[PDB]
Design a protein around this ligand. Structure first.
Ligand code: ON9
Ligand code: 1WV
Length: 382
């Protein structure tokens, strides 16, 4: 059993897995659809890679990482192509080395996209707290990041092919993968799922913080209108106190915004002292000066935040579609070794195609969300 010159039939028969010898009706269609999707992945992801390369506006650290994510899908298109060419009766034709090759290329392609989305999540986590994009230094750093993403992918796709397999542990072979160990699949599934959870936390921290600044901005604009209304001294104080409390929370997060909001804190505190003395008319006039202060920075940050949030939402849709299709397949790996006789693993071909379609979903997402990219795709074809 331990690295014997045994065929794939030996491993597949011992575990509760099917092995065909004849050309089945569903095997012809799963191969037929499989290749058709693979050709589309190798064309749609290649089109968006050329689009970022030729267009001047897409020469930024965030868009270079998107091209690498497409390159990972392009590699996946080649990985699933070799898989679909060796499915059904052609599975028997595979040797021990060639089985680990088709399985290895798929494991490499997943962690290539997993580390890419992880790097994009970190990229968006910095740019939101840094307001705008970085300089040329980051573009040189992105090249280094791309190397780290692909190096991690090659290593993660080599770990089961460098000793961690049930070849010399034939009794601890999984029902789904007859050459892969149960201990590896439990580790692999929990590794990719914990990465999905920490990525959700990263965007939840971004959306939560954006919501907190907009809430403080809503409190600042609403209470400003209250002071404008001819009311008593007590009505002016309660509005300014609500503004001072909103400005201190907005402060918690280059030196332009850090020393920008504190100017408003000073102007509100000076307007508050006027109301405490008894000067209601002077307090309303000082609050009118706060309106001209905020109107000077909305032309420097509010116009640029809309383009940032438009790209941020697009990224979450790419990540969202990735979780919804890959999680049932990864949960299936856990139920394969930790749930014996509770449920049959019949839906194995369905979850495979579900994750395969995602490699084609990414250029479709950028086509209807990104305005500049949608016009660039037509320029290449013509
Ligand atoms: C193709 O048509 C099938 O019918 C078919 C199905 N299989 C079995 C496995 C699919 C499961 C469904 C699925 C979907 C998404 C993620 C994981 C999983 C596991 C597959 O070997 C595999 C194992 C993985 O874990 C290591 C992963 C990963 C990376 O998590 C993997 O990436 C999708 C794919 C094999 C075949 C064909 C060969 C055969 O057996 O004759
Ligand atoms: C540049 C030259 C060639 C082009 C690169 C070829 C290597 C691609 C990675 C292959 C992989 O993941 O290995 C699978 C092993 O697990 C099998 O045992």
């Amino acid at each position: 059993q331990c690295f014997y010159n045994e065929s794939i039939a030996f491993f597949y028969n011992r575990s509760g897995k099917h092995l065909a010898t004849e050309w089945n009706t569903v095997s012809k269609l799963v191969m037929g659809l499989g290749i058709t999707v693979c050709i589309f992945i190798m064309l749609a992801n290649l089109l968006v890679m050329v689009a970022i390369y030729v267009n001047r506006r897409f020469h930024f650290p965030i868009y270079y990482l998107m091209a690498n994510l497409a390159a990972a899908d392009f590699f996946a298109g080649l990985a699933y192509f070799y898989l679909m060419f060796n499915t059904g009766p052609n599975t028997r034709r595979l040797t021990v080395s060639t089985w680990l090759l088709r399985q290895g290329l798929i494991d490499t392609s997943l962690t290539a996209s997993v580390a890419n989305l992880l790097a994009i999540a970190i990229e968006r986590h910095i740019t939101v707290f840094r307001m705008q994009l970085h300089t040329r230094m980051s573009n040189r750093r992105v090249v280094v990041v791309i190397v780290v993403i692909w190096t991690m992918a090659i290593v993660m796709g080599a770990i089961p092919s460098v000793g961690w397999n049930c070849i010399c542990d034939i009794e601890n072979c999984s029902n789904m993968a007859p050459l892969y160990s149960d201990s590896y699949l439990v580790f692999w599934a929990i590794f990719n799922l914990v990465t999905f959870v920490v990525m959700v936390v990263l965007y939840a921290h971004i959306f939560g913080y954006v919501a907190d600044l907009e809430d403080n901005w809503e409190t600042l604009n609403d209470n400003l209108k209250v002071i404008e209304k001819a009311d008593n001294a007590a009505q002016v104080k309660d509005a300014l106190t609500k503004m001072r409390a909103a400005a201190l929370d907005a402060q918690k997060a280059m030196k332009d915004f850090r020393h920008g909001f504190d100017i408003l804190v000073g102007q509100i505190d000076d307007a508050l002292k006027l109301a405490n003395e008894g000067k209601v008319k002077e307090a309303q006039a000082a609050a009118e000066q706060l309106k001209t202060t905020r109107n000077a920075y909305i032309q420097k940050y509010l116009r640029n935040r809309d383009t940032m949030m438009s790209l941020l939402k697009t990224v979450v849709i790419v990540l969202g579609a990735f979780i919804i299709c890959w999680t049932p397949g990864l949960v299936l790996l856990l139920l394969d070794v930790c749930c014996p006789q509770c449920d049959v693993l019949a839906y194995e071909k369905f979850f495979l195609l579900l994750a395969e379609f995602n490699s084609a979903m990414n250029p479709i997402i950028y086509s209807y969300r990104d305005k500049e990219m949608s016009a660039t795709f037509r320029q290449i074809l013509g």
